[PDB]
Design a binder for this molecule. Structure first.
Ligand SMILES: *[C@@H]1O[C@H](CO)[C@@H](O)[C@H](O)[C@H]1NC(C)=O
Ligand SMILES: *[C@@H]1O[C@H](CO)[C@@H](O)[C@H](O)[C@H]1NC(C)=O
Lengths: 34, 34
């Protein structure tokens, strides 16, 4: 599935997590823009 | 964590619940104003 904010939650910054990577998390409210 | 709509679900009115208090729930779409 596409990485979305529906099945992902945010918790703190990425500096404390070992072995993290970078990729875009698609917010579905952005293509709507209603 | 701050009380947000993502981690709470609503079921009926608050007249039936015993010992319930009043507090604000943060709507995350309201500061977005999309
Ligand atoms: C992710 O991006 C930040 C900021 O551009 C960078 O400092 C970090 O090294 C990146 N992560 C990786 C694994 O390259
Ligand atoms: C909570 O709100 C209800 C309805 O406005 C009110 O009757 C009640 O006294 C309030 N309780 C507190 C602790 O403010």
């Amino acid at each position: 599935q596409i990485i979305t904010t529906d099945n992902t939650f945010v918790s703190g910054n990425c500096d404390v997590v070992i072995g993290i990577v970078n990729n875009t998390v698609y917010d579905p409210l952005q293509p709507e823009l209603d």
